[PDB]
Structure formats: structure tokens, C-alpha cells
Amino acid sequence: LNSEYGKVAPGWGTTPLMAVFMGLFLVFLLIILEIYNSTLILDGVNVSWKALG
């Protein structure tokens, strides 16, 4: 019974999909955090007020 859109009533869950997403999150922040904290350094990524496009 896979009637239409993906069905999984209680199941072990949709943990892997989620777990994969909380993962693309923690990686997100760290980046953010490091850039903001100037622990990361990119081209044109100046973290002083002076940045003006």
C-alpha cells in the first residue's frame, strides 16, 4: 500500500532525511560563525563596515 505520495505511518521514521538536514544546518552555522568571526577568509568577503558594493 504505497498509495500516491510517499506513505510511512509510524515507521522507524524519516530520521535519515532529517538527520541529513540537521547536518546541512550545523555545517551552515559553523561556516556563518567562522566567517562572521573572521576565522574564514574569502575573496571580496571583507568583514569590516567598509564593505560596499
Binding site: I32, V45, G53
Partner: peptide
């Protein structure tokens, strides 16, 4: 907004 990185930091209103 400029989606690249230049505007990924907290200063470019983009």
C-alpha cells in the same frame, strides 16, 4: 540581494 558570498556576511544588506 547578491546571493554569492560577498553578501553572505552580516554587512551587505544584500
Amino acid at each position: 540581494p547578491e546571493w554569492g558570498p560577498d553578501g553572505f556576511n552580516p554587512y551587505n544588506p544584500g
